[PDB]
Amino acid sequence: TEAAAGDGGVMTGR
Amino acid sequence: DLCVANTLFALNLFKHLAKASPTQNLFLSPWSISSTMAMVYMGSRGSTEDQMASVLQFNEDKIHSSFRSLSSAINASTGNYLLESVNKLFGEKSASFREEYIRLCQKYYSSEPQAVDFLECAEEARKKINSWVKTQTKGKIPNLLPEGSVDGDTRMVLVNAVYFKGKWKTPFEKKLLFPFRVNSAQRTPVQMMYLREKLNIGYIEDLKAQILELPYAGDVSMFLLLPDADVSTGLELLESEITYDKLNKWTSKDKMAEDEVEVYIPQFKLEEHYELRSILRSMGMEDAFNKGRANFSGMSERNDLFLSEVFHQAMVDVNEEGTGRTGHGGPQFVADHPFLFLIMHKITNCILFFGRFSSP
Numbered sequence: 001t002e003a004a005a006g007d008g009g010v011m012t013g014r
Numbered sequence: 015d016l017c018v019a020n021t022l023f024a025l026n027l028f029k030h031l032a033k034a035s036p037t038q039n040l041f042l043s044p045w046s047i048s049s050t051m052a053m054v055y056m057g058s059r060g061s062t063e064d065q066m067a068s069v070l071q072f073n074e075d076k077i078h079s080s081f082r083s084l085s086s087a088i089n090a091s092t093g094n095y096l097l098e099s100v101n102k103l104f105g106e107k108s109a110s111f112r113e114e115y116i117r118l119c120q121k122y123y124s125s126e127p128q129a130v131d132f133l134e135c136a137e138e139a140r141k142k143i144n145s146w147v148k149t150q151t152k153g154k155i156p157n158l159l160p161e162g163s164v165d166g167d168t169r170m171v172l173v174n175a176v177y178f179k180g181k182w183k184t185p186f187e188k189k190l191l192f193p194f195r196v197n198s199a200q201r202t203p204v205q206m207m208y209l210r211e212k213l214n215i216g217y218i219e220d221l222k223a224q225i226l227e228l229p230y231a232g233d234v235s236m237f238l239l240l241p242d243a244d245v246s247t248g249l250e251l252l253e254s255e256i257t258y259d260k261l262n263k264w265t266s267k268d269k270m271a272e273d274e275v276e277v278y279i280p281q282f283k284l285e286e287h288y289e290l291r292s293i294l295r296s297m298g299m300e301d302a303f304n305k306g307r308a309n310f311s312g313m314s315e316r317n318d319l320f321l322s323e324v325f326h327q328a329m330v331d332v333n334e335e336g337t338g339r340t341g342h343g344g345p346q347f348v349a350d351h352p353f354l355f356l357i358m359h360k361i362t363n364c365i366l367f368f369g370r371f372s373s374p
Contacts, residue, residue: 001178001179001180001182001230001236001330001331001332001333001357002154002178002179002330002331003043003176003177003178003179003328003329003330003331003357003366003367004151004152004154004155004175004176004177004178004328004329004330005042005043005046005151005155005174005175005176005326005327005328005329005367006046006147006150006151006155006158006173006174006175006176006325006326006327006328007043007046007047007049007050007158007173007174007175007324007325007326007327008050008143008147008158008159008163008171008172008173008324008325009050009051009053009054009171009172009173009321009323009324010159010163010164010168010171010321010322010323010324010325011054011057011168011169011170011171011172011310011313011319011320011321011322012165012167012168012169012305012319012320012321012322013106013109013167013168013169013318013319014305014306014308014318014319014320
């Protein structure tokens with residue numbers, strides 16, 4: 001088994 | 015169990031994702047998600063913070079320390095497999111974030127904060143970020159952030175990447191196709207792998223499902239839950255009734271007994287992309303994603319941030335890599351119909367990856 005993941009939280013200016 | 019919050023969150027997330035995607039293949043890394051959202055939570059305050067703690071199951075005050083310790087354990091050198099979890103903070107070069115946030119994030123998440131130019135070169139920054147993840151995942155997750163995901167208003171992107179490559183403790187034989195029952199109107203041929211071996215196998219009566227443990231070399235295993243239901247995938251009962259209590263008893267206590275098992279599982283590969291804002295909002299995390307109500311004053315004392323989206327991409331490639339018996343009196347585990355599976359880090363009891371295989 002090869003397994004991988006990425007996760008990205010995007011913080012935006014107001 | 016030192017990963018309980020993450021497991022509680024993993025199951026609730028799965029359930030909510032299953033409303034969005036009831037029947038197709040699903041695959042994700044809840045560990046990755048939890049680590050990303052812990053970094054974001056560090057930055058949150060007020061009602062935003064309160065909601066995130068509830069949703070991530072921290073309420074079920076040393077959360078960041080736990081993440082660092084869990085992460086050290088998952089990253090621990092073994093000769094048995096490649097397994098790496100890494101966090102990364104990309105920040106707008108002209109923005110001024112709270113020094114305590116940058117310090118504590120590095121201390122607890124090792125996110126090596128790095129300046130980039132979202133303000134004027136958002137597309138280049140998107141590319142740089144994707145390229146970083148691509149490297150961390152050995153090419154397997156090449157374009158995490160889709161086009162349009164970052165712009166001149168972006169101030170920070172919090173990233174986790176996770177990579178795992180292991181061999182089975184006992185290799186499978188590639189059977190050199192069997193009908194896989196997709197639903198009551200459809201069967202699709204799949205390449206099966208066969209193994210006869212001494213393995214932990216049980217049955218969870220509350221979920222009407224067989225459970226099987228397939229160990230990798232080292233202290234990582236895959237657990238498979240195979241219903242024995244509906245005219246669709248056959249998973250409705252399992253998916254709606256599964257809980258931490260029900261699962262943990264079988265994965266982590268000793269309810270399973272070792273027996274000689276004949277195992278048939280498909281060779282398969284999944285690649286799935288999700289955008290989790292809607293799921294997370296539905297779980298109770300509303301203020302974080304609300305441009306006017308979010309409080310991320312932990313990240314910036316100007317309190318001028320909100321969370322726009324959480325992009326997840328996950329993949330898995332399951333294959334065979336690891337005489338004279340003719341009786342068939344004992345146990346069979348024939349995964350020719352949909353099943354849930356998870357990859358468990360046995361030392362921490364963390365779920366690294368979780369999926370539904372339903373459609374070859």
